[PDB]
C-alpha cells in the first residue's frame, strides 16, 4: 500500500544554478551532491535534482499547470515572499505565491492544508462538486 510521497525529482539543466536557487529558500537543506544530481530535504520532503541535458528552460506560458507547492505558515508567508521578490524570482500567475525555478518548474507557496481547503469548499462549492463522506 502507498504510504505517501517518497521523493520529488526535478530535471535541471545546470546543477550549480539550481543548487544556488534552492539553497536561498529557508527550510531547504542540502544533504549531498554529485556530478549529475543532488539530494535535498525540506521538512519531510525528499527533493532530488537530476541533471538532464534534455531539460529545457521553458517559459511559463508554454507548460501546463503542473506545479509543486510548499507549506508556509501564515505568520511567515509575507517574509518568504519578500525574500523571493528581492532575489528576483519570476512569478508565473497571480494565500498563494507562484514562482518559478531556474529551469521553469512551477512552484508555489501556500498557507493551509487539504482539511482547510475542503472545509472552505463545503461552504462554497465549485461547479459540479461532490464530497465523499
Q: Is 110 annotated as a binding residue?
A: no
Give min distance, CB of 119 to Ni ion, in A: 10
Q: Give 95's Cβ-side CA count (13 Å radius).
A: 16
Site for Ni ion in 30-49 (CB under 5 A): none
Strand duo 106-110 + 45-51: pairing: unpaired
Sites of contact with Mn ion (CB under 5 A): 69, 108
Among 20, 69, 87, 120, binds a second copy (CB under 8 A): 69
Among 30, 57, 60, 81, binds a second copy (CB under 8 A): 30
Q: Beta partners for 29?
A: 41
User: Could you tell me the CA-to-CA distances from 77 to 29, 44, 73, 116 in Å, in that order?
Assistant: 19, 19, 6, 17
- Asked whether position 73 contacts a second copy by CB under 8 A, the answer is yes
Among 20, 36, 85, 120, binds a second copy (CB under 8 A): 36
- Asked whether position 127 contacts a second copy by CB under 8 A, the answer is yes
Q: How far apart are CA 111 and CA 119, in angstroms?
A: 14
User: Could you tell me the CA-to-CA distances from 102 to 7, 10, 27, 63, 99 in Å, in that order?
Assistant: 20, 11, 18, 14, 10
Asked if 45 and 8 touch (Cβ cutoff 8 Å), the reply is yes
Instruction: Please enumerate, by residue number, every residue annotated as part of a binding site.
Output: 7, 67, 108
The contact set with Ni ion (CB under 5 A) reads 123
The contact set with a second copy (CB under 8 A) reads 1-11, 25-28, 30-37, 39, 41-46, 50, 52, 54-56, 64-73, 76, 80, 105, 108-110, 113-114, 117-118, 121, 125-133
Amino acid at each position: 500500500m502507498l504510504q505517501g510521497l517518497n521523493h520529488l525529482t526535478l530535471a535541471v539543466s545546470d546543477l550549480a544554478s539550481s543548487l544556488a536557487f534552492y539553497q536561498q529558500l529557508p527550510g531547504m537543506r542540502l544533504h549531498a551532491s554529485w556530478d549529475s544530481g543532488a539530494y535535498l530535504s525540506c521538512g519531510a520532503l525528499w527533493l532530488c535534482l537530476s541533471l538532464d541535458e534534455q531539460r529545457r528552460k521553458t517559459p511559463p506560458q508554454e507548460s501546463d499547470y503542473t506545479h509543486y507547492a510548499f507549506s508556509v505558515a501564515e505568520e511567515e508567508f509575507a517574509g518568504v515572499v519578500a525574500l523571493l521578490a528581492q532575489a528576483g524570482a519570476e512569478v508565473w500567475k497571480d494565500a498563494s505565491y507562484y514562482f518559478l525555478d531556474p529551469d521553469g518548474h512551477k512552484l508555489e507557496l501556500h498557507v493551509g492544508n487539504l482539511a482547510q481547503r475542503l472545509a472552505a469548499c463545503r461552504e462554497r462549492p465549485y461547479k459540479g462538486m461532490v464530497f465523499f463522506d
